[PDB]
Amino acid sequence: QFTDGYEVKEDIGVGSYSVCKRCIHKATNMEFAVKIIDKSKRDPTEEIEILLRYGQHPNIITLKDVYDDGKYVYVVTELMKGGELLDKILRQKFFSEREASAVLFTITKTVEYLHAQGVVHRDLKPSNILYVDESGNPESIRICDFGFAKQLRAENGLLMTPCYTANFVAPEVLERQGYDAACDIWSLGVLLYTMLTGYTPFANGPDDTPEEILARIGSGKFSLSGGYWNSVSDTAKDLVSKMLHVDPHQRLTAALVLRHPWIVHWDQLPQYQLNRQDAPHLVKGAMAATYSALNRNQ
Ligand code: NA
């Protein structure tokens, strides 16, 4: 009885396992997004329980309603009307370090919360961090698409957080959750690198092969020097180098990112424009190529 309460409008995204559409709540005229998931092709139970428990976070996409008609599950959420955060920030020619730090603070506070509750997102690409409206302020940021996220659970399967280690979990999955949480931070490091310079750390555009992108990720070195970087703060460059550390064990955690001087002393950061490449569509293609390369064994 979704179509009893909601008028369905056009596709916002099509996927192999679901379609996302705009819809209108009939009685109130308010607009929403609906993710329609094929129950034969995918089981969305984990995703819905995470949204139910954690969607009241101000910066996580909020669940408004859910239906199941047997063949499809309908997950109604707030509609993102401000577009993609990275793309909107790359198209702002006067964006500054100080605004970049405020944005990373808001996203990283949200990921610190999720990791502390035992939830890893595992798909934190730019295309899943969006603005709910065009106000441009930090309260409008949303982490979206928890269709790959996982809640930590102990050996007997009870829901756990990484502090309650007084029930047995195989150090196995404790190490795998540590790795997925460190991948979330690496993704935030790729976001920050691109926000500061207007280009991606491991790909130049959509035609980079997956093998050349993976060889750059593996080298453990990247440029924090030269035209677009030279003028960025050394503290920003230090933070970026530690979030993109090639060794997942030595990578900063979300907790430690939030203690970095570049986040803590935001009031001392420059408010004049960054010197960046202006090629937001090229970045979109580089970022799709980077995550296609990395996710090719799912
Ligand atoms: Na929310």
UniProtKB/Swiss-Prot annotation:
Signal peptide: none annotated. Residues 6-263 form the Protein kinase domain. The active site is at residue 123. Intestine, thymus, lung, heart and brain. The modification Phosphotyrosine is found at residue 113. It comes from the Eukaryota. It is found in: Nucleus; Cytoplasm. Disruption phenotype: Mice were born at expected Mendelian ratio but display decreased bone mass. Embryos and pups show a delay in mineralization of the skull with frontal, parietal, and interparietal bones of reduced size. Mice also display a significant reduction in long bone length at one month of age. N-terminal myristoylation results in an activated kinase in the absence of added growth factors. ATP binds at residues 12-20, 35. Belongs to the protein kinase superfamily. AGC Ser/Thr protein kinase family. S6 kinase subfamily. Serine/threonine-protein kinase that acts downstream of ERK (MAPK1/ERK2 and MAPK3/ERK1) signaling and mediates mitogenic and stress-induced activation of the transcription factors CREB1, ETV1/ER81 and NR4A1/NUR77, regulates translation through RPS6 and EIF4B phosphorylation, and mediates cellular proliferation, survival, and differentiation by modulating mTOR signaling and repressing pro-apoptotic function of BAD and DAPK1. Forms a complex with either MAPK1/ERK2 or MAPK3/ERK1 in quiescent cells. Transiently dissociates following mitogenic stimulation. Interacts with NFATC4, ETV1/ER81 and FGFR1. This is Ribosomal protein S6 kinase alpha-3. It comes from Mus musculus (Mouse). The chain holds residues 417 to 714 of 740 of the full protein.
